[PDB]
């Protein structure tokens, strides 16, 4: 049970890590996404003018 | 003649080192030992400065 606790301790703080890295992804992605849509809107305006 | 003081000079020494480690490791948790065994022993044997 003493190695049990360390074995799950590895588990936990590994899953905490992949979760933190998970954040990084969606946190960055959600933002690259926004900066893309805005770039699209910089064009869409011109298009919407011709339209 | 002091050299030939302890009659089992090797026996004297292991006896003493085994004990020092044996005692210092009992204090320590396994995982904690396994990661630091180098320093854990290395200290247990010598009077840390």
Notable features of this structure?
part of a larger assembly; 2 chains; 51 residues; mainly alpha; rod-shaped
Compact description:
The structure is cut from a larger assembly and holds 2 copies of chain A. Chain A is mostly helical. In chain A, 96% of the residues lie in helices and 0% in strands.
Characterise the protein shown here:
This is part of a larger assembly, with two copies of chain A. With about 50 residues, chain A is mainly alpha-helical. The first copy, chain A, is built from one helix and no strands. The first copy, chain A, has one helix spanning about 1-50. Chain A starts with a helix and ends with a helix. At the A-B interface, helix 1 of A face loops of B. The PDB classes it as structural protein.
- Rg of chain A from C-alpha positions? 22 Å
Q: How helix-rich are the residues of chain A, as a percent range?
A: over 70%
Order of helices and strands of chain A: H
Secondary structure tally, helices of chain A:
1
The share of residues in extended strands of chain A comes to under 5%
Pair with the biggest interface: A-B, 3 and 3 residues
| Form type of chain A | rod-shaped
Structural class of chain A: mainly alpha
What's the story with the biggest beta sheet of chain A?
A: none
| Quaternary organization | part of a larger assembly
Based on DSSP secondary structure assignment, what is the total number of beta strands of chain A? 0
Subcellular location (chain B): Cytoplasm; Nucleus
Organism (chain B): Rattus norvegicus
Protein name (chain B): Major vault protein
């Amino acid at each position: 049970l003493a190695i049990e606790i360390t074995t799950n301790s590895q588990e936990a703080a590994a899953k905490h890590e992949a979760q933190r890295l998970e954040q990084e992804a969606r946190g960055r992605l959600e933002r690259q996404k926004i900066l893309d849509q805005s770039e699209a809107e910089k064009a869409r305006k011109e298009l919407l003018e011709l339209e | 003649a002091k050299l030939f003081s302890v009659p089992d000079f090797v026996g004297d020494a292991c006896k003493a080192i085994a004990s020092r480690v044996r005692g210092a490791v009992a204090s320590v948790t396994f995982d904690d030992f396994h990661k630091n065994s180098a320093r854990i022993i290395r200290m247990a044997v010598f009077g840390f400065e």
